[PDB]
Amino acid sequence: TGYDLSASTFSPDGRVFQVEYAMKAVENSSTAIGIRCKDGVVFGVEKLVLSKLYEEGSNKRLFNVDRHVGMAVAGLLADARSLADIAREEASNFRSNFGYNIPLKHLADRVAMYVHAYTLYSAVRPFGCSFMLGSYSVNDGAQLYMIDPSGVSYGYWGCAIGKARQAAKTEIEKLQMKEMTCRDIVKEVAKIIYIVHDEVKDKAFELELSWVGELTNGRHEIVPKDIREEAEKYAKESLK
Amino acid sequence: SYDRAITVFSPDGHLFQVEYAQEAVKKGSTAVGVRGRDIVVLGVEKKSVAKLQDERTVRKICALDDNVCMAFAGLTADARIVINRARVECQSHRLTVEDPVTVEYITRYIASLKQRYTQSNGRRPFGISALIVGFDFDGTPRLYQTDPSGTYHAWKANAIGRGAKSVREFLEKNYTDEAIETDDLTIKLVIKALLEVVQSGGKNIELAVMRRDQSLKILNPEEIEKYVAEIEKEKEENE
Amino acid sequence: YDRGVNTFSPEGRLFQVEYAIEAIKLGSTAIGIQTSEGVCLAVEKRITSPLMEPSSIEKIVEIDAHIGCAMSGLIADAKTLIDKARVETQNHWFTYNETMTVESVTQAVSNLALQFGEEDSRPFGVALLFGGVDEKGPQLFHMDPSGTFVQCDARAIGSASEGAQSSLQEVYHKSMTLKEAIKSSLIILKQVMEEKLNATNIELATVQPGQNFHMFTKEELEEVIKDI
Amino acid sequence: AERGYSFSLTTFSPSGKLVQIEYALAAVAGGAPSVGIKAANGVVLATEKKQKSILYDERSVHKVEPITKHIGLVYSGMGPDYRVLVHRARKLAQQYYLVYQEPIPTAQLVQRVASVMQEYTQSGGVRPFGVSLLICGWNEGRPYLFQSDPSGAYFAWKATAMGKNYVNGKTFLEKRYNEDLELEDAIHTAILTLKESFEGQMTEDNIEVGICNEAGFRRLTPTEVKDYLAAIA
Amino acid sequence: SSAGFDRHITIFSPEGRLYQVEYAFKAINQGGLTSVAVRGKDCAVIVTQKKVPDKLLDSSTVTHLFKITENIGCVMTGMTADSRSQVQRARYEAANWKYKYGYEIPVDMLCKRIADISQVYTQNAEMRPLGCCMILIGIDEEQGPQVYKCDPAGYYCGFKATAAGVKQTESTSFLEKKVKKKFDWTFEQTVETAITCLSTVLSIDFKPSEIEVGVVTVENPKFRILTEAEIDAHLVALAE
Amino acid sequence: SRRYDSRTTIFSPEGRLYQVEYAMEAIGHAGTCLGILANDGVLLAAERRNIHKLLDEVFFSEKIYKLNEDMACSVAGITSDANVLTNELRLIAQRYLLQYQEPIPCEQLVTALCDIKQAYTQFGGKRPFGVSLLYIGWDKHYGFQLYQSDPSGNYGGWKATCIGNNSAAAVSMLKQDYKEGEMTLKSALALAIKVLNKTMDVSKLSAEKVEIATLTRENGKTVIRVLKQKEVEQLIKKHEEEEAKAEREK
Amino acid sequence: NQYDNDVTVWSPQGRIHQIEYAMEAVKQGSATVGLKSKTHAVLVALKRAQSELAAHQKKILHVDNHIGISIAGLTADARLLCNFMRQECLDSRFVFDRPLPVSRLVSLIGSKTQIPTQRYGRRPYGVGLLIAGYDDMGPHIFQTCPSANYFDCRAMSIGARSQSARTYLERHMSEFMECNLNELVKHGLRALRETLPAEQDLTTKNVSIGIVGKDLEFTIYDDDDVSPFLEGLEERPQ
Amino acid sequence: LEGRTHIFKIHARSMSVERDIRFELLARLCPNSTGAEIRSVCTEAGMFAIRARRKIATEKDFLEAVNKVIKSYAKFSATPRYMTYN
Amino acid sequence: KRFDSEKAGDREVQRTMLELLNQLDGFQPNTQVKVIAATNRVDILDPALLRSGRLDRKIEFPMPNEEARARIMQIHSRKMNVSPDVNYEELARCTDDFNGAQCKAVCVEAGMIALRRGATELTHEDYMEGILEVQAKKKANLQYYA
Ligand SMILES: Nc1ncnc2c1ncn2[C@@H]1O[C@H](COP(=O)(O)OP(=O)(O)OP(=O)(O)O)[C@@H](O)[C@H]1O
């Protein structure tokens, strides 16, 4: 009876209703996944199609915060760009006072202290964005971290948010991940990406893919469709 | 339960804390006043004096200057606030530009200050009103009023409080244009309204008259005691 | 089910702004008229008792020398906007050596149309009729407490804004002279007043490039009265 | 209205009584017993600390936290908001000590703290202190024992008691303790009134007896507590 | 008793009780973890664990062991989101005392300065009480090791051996009888009793890689923990 | 946060101040004081709600609190709630001596403290002061003056007062006692004794539960006579013989 | 009903209704269709008036030289952002001496409206801005919503019953990329003519039109400026 | 606003109505009065008619009491429906 | 079952349902004559309803899509006259959250106005007229909102 009003108050069951509503708020958004190979980290984003809707290559949830770091985000898009600028401004403070690459561990920790703080106050509101953080460096290596709206900082080799299909991360164990060079990895993930998330719910869709690792020498950028072209090349013939 | 809004206001067409503050106005102490070419008269009653206390602490009339007189109706709590407030306002006005602005600066001060006093958050509107008394320059009278909404207005007659004090202003309209040509009858109007207004005790009644530019003094029970006797005689002349 | 009054209700829109529109019901009405020769505007003071002094309450004030204005609803609510708007046009003549004409006054007030807020205050329900003569000649503009400025050549406010404008929109055809609209307004005036027309009841606002200022005069207010 | 910066949450009941401040007295009543005695040379305090589990050692956490070398003190009821005003009193007692150059009396600690403690209750958005402080010490050759309350009202008692059944222990301290006695005799009846609501087991860690000497406050170790009270009182 | 909107904010009750604060009791239950502290003569040993629902779990990132100072570490319970915001505050005042004071840190009274910030969290108008539970060890000169467990009510608490949490209530029951009587404590004796006190609760007794045993003993005063090597040897040493 | 606000500052629908009406219910209870006109002096008396005899009474003046060597104020209400206003007005009385070097008159002294209590009532939603205290002193203009404070922010100043509950039988008797001033300072105190003896709940006129402080006008020291309770008992038994003499008539 | 009181509450479905209620203010605006081709862009709005004599309210207004925009919804919060829109324009025109690409420009507006949609007591901004501007890569058509999500497109339609324009667009908007300015404007108003009731005009002065290009500076076209655009067209069928 | 005279049309057959009465004049003075509150208009018309011993009721007669019946009955409650569901 | 009982207004049936659920549990022959259940809201659901003999097939019904909303309105009208000259695309996309039963009322209101119109023939614009009619809400318009 109103225990979900103030974000600064607990609940009769001893948890935060504001976070419980924030966890499923990210689930209604389209799927954005991530995975890390040995020398690199892979990102992906699904783009839903209802009517048209608009130009392809628009408002992609894939963003680039820093040289070696990138953003695979889900949920409300405007709240993601705000966290994109905060992570960009935080990356600007590190490159200024220090001048080298910001470690992914503490970069996620800075955002972990932010996302957690907004959930504590009833004035502001929690975040409806659950994103993926991953990076690779020559002196660090490939790490991937999963951040949740509750403010828990941690990471696995892979995680999945967005829509509830979750079958696109199943075939990854059926293929070589840490053994592969991250090159063929791009086209190996996209097979079931097309199969599952059936066309009954959404007639058409579109896929974005991004990668950062050794082949780019630590740089992060979205893999072009024309180069190396084998991304969507092998994806169409792997549906069976 | 309790369902109400505060500010502002209500779709029903009337405000909340404003017109309800008018109830805290009309419930104020009964007071009257008039304007004249020379001597302006005022009055106050319904102070509920028990005869056992000091009259100077319950005095309802102060003066910012000898030219301008203050008359208010309501609780005496916010009074000294405005007394401290307005006196510093007319002081800082006395400070620079020695010649003061005439009657349009001071009447819009408390009025506009009370209007913005209902504007910003954390400010509770005053439930009291006031009517400025005095004389304009070049021998003209000056009187105005304060409204909970901050609207300044000039009256030919001051009628507030109970329905008995409204008769005092009704008697002024019976003097038509010419009356009064003597100050005796103009003071006697307060001595006549003393019986009509309130409990007719002859105690809570107090008045002061400012003739032209001369600073008024509180009436001592000699003049007003002599004019109280002619008030009953003048009413007997009409019989 | 009152949430913050600023919170965009289920319908939805602001509560207090929706309330402040009803605040026009508690106050008098006016009638605007515009013509190529000049702009004439009329009002009614709504005298409750003879104790009311006519020059005490005036519903027409001139913001700038050539720019008149008309208030609505309460008085002191507009008085804060009225008096502060006079500072605007004067500083514009300081920087640019030219006064605001009929336009830069609008955007000045349009920027401050809604300044209200709870955190970081209360919006006024007073409608404003902006008259004046710009480089384009005599012009009359209108705005509402909601904050959206829409150009209204001849506009009426008050609780009579519904009825008074209905017959007024028909008579604004460009073939009508200014002199025909002057006597057309008093026809609606005598219908919307319960008390017989007297020198203290109504006032007029007329501004022209040649005749000024004007503003308005005294004893010429009573001439349009006896002609009723 | 206004900001939301925590305006006062304390209102007046139809009878005029305080709402949340009187509820803080329930925490004092639902707290732990603490007693003190002002007699003759100095003031003697007897508190009660019992471990809820056998794994708790009383040698670390100390109930008595003296404000000054010559000023002792104890508390009753509720810790978290208690240490806030304690350390605040440590910073506040310095202005009197630096400017006036003097071992500030307990009466001035009462005037300054209870004024801020009353201002703390007047400030809303925060729960009032549920701690009833017993202020003692020695000043101007004559010691003092003063009792405060969550509302800020300060009293003066020869022998006072707080906590569970404080009205019953107050009558015992009214009868068994009267006029004034030596500090040794003051420790005696201070433990006897503490053994009233105490359990059937009394050891060095179960009760701790503070004493304010004319030479200034000296906190007795659990050694002297088991030596005098064994064999309590 | 409850009257009005008191249920919807953090304040007292008509009976003087608390609701929000007492709803933080089960705020640890969603995490479902356990931490027990055992201290010896010259040593102190902490026992904890972690849950691995998926093979993607990284041992380093999901590690629940937090190190405040080289000489003094710590551990948390409950939801890990609120714990991390208290981690830097435990590091903050640490470095403040290392800088200004320049010695072994308030091994006793440090829980007062931490609980003060923890009370500010509770004393704030509208803010989350942060129900994470802080647990510290300690090292002092000729005082032996110290063990301290703080709770987010704003008070300082610590003793020889203390266990508080979901299932920690049954763990202290064995420690009361195990310590005394009369007994001493050696290095391996405290490590062996870390499991036996939990053996009175659950102790599924599986591969040690999931459980983490914190240990501090005075030889080199610096706190530290081994990896997987002899912890299993201490697990097979206690069982003969 | 609009529902959590109880609208303390804002008025009641009935025209009364909602917070102040429940405030003055505490003034009718708790503190009890009195005042009367007296020539070449002024007297003050109060009865303690702490009157339980287990206190040390080492505070000397308690309910009688003396703000300045030349001025005292009898307080009715919560002690520490009033103690915020004591030192405040004490500093207001002291800052007056700083920029002037002349004793603060009683008129503007009351209007200064009443506005401090009024500021919390008009805005901020803060808890208003439920303390109503008296005022005594002397000035070179109006001479002896008596005043009272109200929680709404108004000065309740008159030449007489009824505070806060009992003294009832003496109240109407004070209107028959309205004859203005006298001394013989012991005669005016004798009239105060029949008030404390007759109208007390346990009666008996307990000496330890009440304290009488009198201000005697003196040039230029203005000596305040604080009775040591040794001369109160003989002052109590002084009018008890007169009260026994007053009943000899009928 | 007690859990629906505040703004901070997420619905049992996890949606904040305050943004949805601000979406209603955008729908009540006039029907307007912004669009771009692969060469030149054309945006069209609709003027409304409360009374007959009242001049038709303008929507399309020029801000940047190469950036035209329409407006719908709350005018107050629009004029606020309008002064903020002029700011960032002259900012880069002063320090950088170059204009701002619409891509990164609108990213600042989305972040400007993020704070009022978060903190308690703050309100979102109903916004109907349809932005058309030219960076080095050509024209862009974005959208504006109280949720602060801008979508790059060739064309969009907002306002009252403006979804009917998209249905005319989806087939035509793909074929409108190759058409020069002349026929594009008259084909543009052909989309909004079914958005108005078919039984009445659709006059000259009740509609807003503007055109901007790489080498063409954006100019407001209204009243008689629409006469060459409305002439030489076919009426709607029955 | 133009429909308040329709409830006055059925009430124009009540008792004896003078031809000088204008129903459009008093309609605007009583907002949100429906047919119930203006049923009292023609009631207070005949009410004070017999109180004053007169027969018919002119417009100015009862409307002077109508401006009272709206305001004096709005002192305790102004009869809003907005606050019911809100 | 509320939380604190007893009891609700559903007493006889909440014992009846859990008895309807009981004979499915204790008695195996009850697997005969399958029973269909229907609810208008998921807010209150008894966890005991999960069983083979009890509720098994569960599919959440959201608001039908634009293709389905256009369909159902035509397939509810197969029993009656359907107006020609219909794109079916415009009436489909303009429907957001509108109920299927309200789509029947669209052809009702469009058929009710056909009376006063004098012609029983309807146009494609009449659909979207009655579609926006019933929802969102009725009947007012946006003013004073700037
Ligand atoms: N426009 C009107 N025409 C005729 N009579 C009217 C009109 N408006 C109101 N009335 C009369 O006012 C009287 C009072 O209505 P009443 O208060 O009984 O409605 P109600 O039944 O309470 O409404 P609800 O059921 O919504 O609460 C009715 O008897 C009705 O005849």
UniProtKB/Swiss-Prot annotation, chain A:
Modified residues (Phosphoserine): S238
Gene3D superfamilies (UniProt xref): Glutamine Phosphoribosylpyrophosphate, subunit 1, domain 1
Keyword list, A-Z: Acetylation, Cytoplasm, Host-virus interaction, Nucleus, Phosphoprotein, Proteasome
Disulphide bonds in the chain: none
Record InterPro entries: Ntn_hydrolases_N (IPR029055), Proteasome_alpha (IPR050115), Proteasome_alpha-type (IPR023332), Proteasome_asu_N (IPR000426), Proteasome_sua/b (IPR001353)
Alphabetized CDD domains for the sequence: proteasome_alpha_type_3
Residues recorded with modification N6-acetyllysine: K52, K201, K225
Main location: cytoplasm
Coiled coil: none
Description of how the protein assembles with itself and partners: The 26S proteasome consists of a 20S proteasome core and two 19S regulatory subunits. The 20S proteasome core is a barrel-shaped complex made of 28 subunits that are arranged in four stacked rings. The two outer rings are each formed by seven alpha subunits, and the two inner rings are formed by seven beta subunits. The proteolytic activity is exerted by three beta-subunits PSMB5, PSMB6 and PSMB7. Interacts with AURKB. Interacts with CDKN1A. Interacts with MDM2 and RB1. Interacts with the C-terminus of TBXA2R isoform 2. Interacts with DNAJB2. (Microbial infection) Interacts with HIV-1 Tat protein.
Record-stated family: Belongs to the peptidase T1A family.
Protein name from the UniProt record: Proteasome subunit alpha type-3
Swiss-Prot record, chain E:
Cytoplasm found in the keyword field: yes
Keywords noted in UniProt: Acetylation, Cytoplasm, Glycoprotein, Nucleus, Phosphoprotein, Proteasome
PTM annotation (Phosphoserine): residues: S13, S59, S60
An individual GO BP term: proteasome-mediated ubiquitin-dependent protein catabolic process
CDD domains, sorted: proteasome_alpha_type_6 (cd03754)
Residues recorded with modification Phosphotyrosine: Y155
Modified residues (N6-acetyllysine): K98, K100
SUPFAM superfamilies: N-terminal nucleophile aminohydrolases (Ntn hydrolases)
Protein origin, superkingdom: Eukaryota
Role played: Component of the 20S core proteasome complex involved in the proteolytic degradation of most intracellular proteins. This complex plays numerous essential roles within the cell by associating with different regulatory particles. Associated with two 19S regulatory particles, forms the 26S proteasome and thus participates in the ATP-dependent degradation of ubiquitinated proteins.
Family: Belongs to the peptidase T1A family.
Protein name in the entry: Proteasome subunit alpha type-6
High-level lineage: Eukaryota, Metazoa, Chordata, Craniata, Vertebrata
From Swiss-Prot, chain G:
Protein's name in the database: Proteasome subunit alpha type-1
Keyword Ubl conjugation: yes
Biological role: Component of the 20S core proteasome complex involved in the proteolytic degradation of most intracellular proteins. This complex plays numerous essential roles within the cell by associating with different regulatory particles. Associated with two 19S regulatory particles, forms the 26S proteasome and thus participates in the ATP-dependent degradation of ubiquitinated proteins.
Similarity section: Belongs to the peptidase T1A family.
Protein's UniProt keywords contain Repressor: no
Organism: Homo sapiens (Human)
Phosphoserine modifications at: S107, S174
This protein's encoding gene: PSMA1
Domain of life: Eukaryota
InterPro entries: Ntn_hydrolases_N (IPR029055), Proteasome_alpha (IPR050115), Proteasome_alpha-type (IPR023332), Proteasome_alpha1 (IPR035144), Proteasome_asu_N (IPR000426), Proteasome_sua/b (IPR001353)
Subunit structure: The 26S proteasome consists of a 20S proteasome core and two 19S regulatory subunits. The 20S proteasome core is a barrel-shaped complex made of 28 subunits that are arranged in four stacked rings. The two outer rings are each formed by seven alpha subunits, and the two inner rings are formed by seven beta subunits. The proteolytic activity is exerted by three beta-subunits PSMB5, PSMB6 and PSMB7. Interacts with NOTCH3. Interacts with ZFAND1.
Induction line: Induced in breast cancer tissue (at protein level). Up-regulated in liver tumor tissues.
Annotated glycosylation sites: S107
An MF annotation (GO) of this entry: lipopolysaccharide binding
Disulfide-linked positions: none
UniProtKB/Swiss-Prot annotation, chain I:
Coiled-coil region(s): none
Source organism, top-level taxon: Eukaryota
Positions of post-translational Phosphoserine modification: S83
Post-translational modification summary for this protein: Sumoylated by UBE2I in response to MEKK1-mediated stimuli.
Localization in the cell: Cytoplasm; Nucleus
UniProt record similarity statement: Belongs to the AAA ATPase family.
Disorder: Deafness, cataract, impaired intellectual development, and polyneuropathy: An autosomal recessive disease characterized by early onset of deafness, cataract, severe developmental delay, and severely impaired intellectual development. Patients later develop polyneuropathy of the lower extremities, associated with depigmentation of the hair in that area.
Function: Component of the 26S proteasome, a multiprotein complex involved in the ATP-dependent degradation of ubiquitinated proteins. This complex plays a key role in the maintenance of protein homeostasis by removing misfolded or damaged proteins, which could impair cellular functions, and by removing proteins whose functions are no longer required. Therefore, the proteasome participates in numerous cellular processes, including cell cycle progression, apoptosis, or DNA damage repair.
Name listed for the protein in its UniProt record: 26S proteasome regulatory subunit 6A
Part of the whole protein covered: 294 to 439 of 439
